[PDB]
Subunit: 188 residues, 2 copies
C-alpha cells in the first residue's frame, strides 16, 4: 500500500526469481508502480535495498519464532519449540524462505549486515546456547561456530522439507530433523 | 587451455561475481576469448553451462576429498579425514567454494542436477552413512535428511572459516567443527 512497501515486496519477489545482479532498479520501480526517483529516495542504492529487505525478513523470522515459544524453563523443550516454529515459518512463507536460502549465508550480503542479523536480530540464539552450556546440556565449542552451525542445519532441513513437502507431514521426519540439530550441540 | 575449459573457468568467475541472470552469454564468450558461436556449440544454453559447471566443480570436490583419505577401517577416523579434506579444499579454492555457497543448496540449480551431484557424484557419502548405521555408530534417521544435514554443516563451517581465516589455523576451532558434524549423526 505504501510506496516503500511496494518497493520492498516487489524487490523480494525479483531478488528471488531473477537474483540481485539479474534485477535492475528500473524493473523494481516499474513492477512496484513507482518512479525510479522515488525508489532512490527511500533506497540510495540496490545494495541498501537488499540490506534493508534482508534485515526486515530476518526481524520477521526472529519475531515469529520467539512469539511461538512460551518457556516452562526446560532448554531442550524451548529449543524444540523454536526449531519447529522456525521450520513451520519456512513452510508458511515460501518466498521469504527461498530468499534466506539464496542470501542468508551467501557472499552477496555484506559481512557487517550478516553480523547485525546474527548477533543483533538473532542475538537470543547465542544466549540460549550460553544457558545450555552453563546447565551442562550443551558442548563448549566456540559460540559463533555453534550459531553458524544452527544456521546451516536450519537451511539444510528447510531445503529438505521444501524438496520433499510430503515428508514435513511425517512426524518421524520432523523428529529426525530436531535430533540432528540438538545432537550436534549436546554434551557427549 | 581448451576452448571448453576457458568458457567453464570464465563462467565460474562471472557466475560468482555477477550471478547467473546478471551474466550474459556474450560477456562469457568475450571474457573466455571465444566467438559466441563456439560457446553455444559446447553449451546450447546458459542453463546447460551452469549445470555442466556445477557437476564439474562437484566432481573436483568429490575427487579431492576421496584422494586425501588413507582409510584404516575406522569410520569415525575416515569421516574426520573427509571432513578436514573438504574444509581444506574450501580454503584452497576460494572461487569454487564461493560458487558452492551461492549455488549448492539454492533454488537456482535444477533439482534433477542437484540430485545427480548428491546421489551420483557424492553417492559415497550415503554409503558411509549406511555403513555407520549398520555398525551401530550412526543414528537411524532418513539418509537423505542426514546427507542434506552433512551439506548444511559443511556450508556453515566453511562460512565460519572463510569469515574468520585465522581460526582455521587453530586446532581447537578445527576439532570443534568436526565434533558438531560427527555428533549430529552419532548414536545416542
Ligand atoms: Cl513468503
Ligand atoms: Cl578456486
Amino acid at each position: 500500500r505504501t510506496k516503500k512497501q511496494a518497493i520492498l515486496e516487489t524487490a523480494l519477489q525479483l531478488f528471488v526469481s531473477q537474483g540481485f545482479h539479474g534485477t535492475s532498479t528500473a524493473t523494481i520501480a516499474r513492477e512496484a508502480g513507482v518512479a525510479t526517483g522515488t525508489l532512490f529516495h527511500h533506497f540510495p542504492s540496490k545494495e541498501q535495498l537488499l540490506e534493508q529487505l534482508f534485515l526486515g525478513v530476518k526481524q520477521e523470522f526472529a519475531d515469529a519464532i520467539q512469539a511461538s515459544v512460551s518457556s516452562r524453563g526446560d532448554l531442550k523443550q524451548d529449543a524444540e519449540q523454536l526449531w519447529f516454529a522456525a521450520l513451520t515459518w519456512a513452510m508458511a512463507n515460501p518466498l521469504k524462505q527461498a530468499f534466506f536460502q539464496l542470501y542468508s549465508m551467501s557472499p552477496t550480503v555484506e559481512q557487517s549486515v550478516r553480523d547485525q542479523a546474527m548477533h543483533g536480530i538473532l542475538g537470543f540464539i547465542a544466549e540460549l546456547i550460553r544457558q545450555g552450556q552453563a546447565s551442562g546440556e550443551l558442548a563448549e565449542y566456540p559460540i559463533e561456530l555453534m550459531q553458524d552451525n544452527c544456521h546451516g542445519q536450519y537451511l539444510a532441513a528447510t531445503r529438505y522439507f521444501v524438496d520433499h513437502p510430503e515428508r514435513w507431514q511425517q512426524a518421524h521426519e520432523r523428529s529426525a530433523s530436531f535430533a540432528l540439530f540438538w545432537n550436534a550441540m549436546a554434551v557427549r
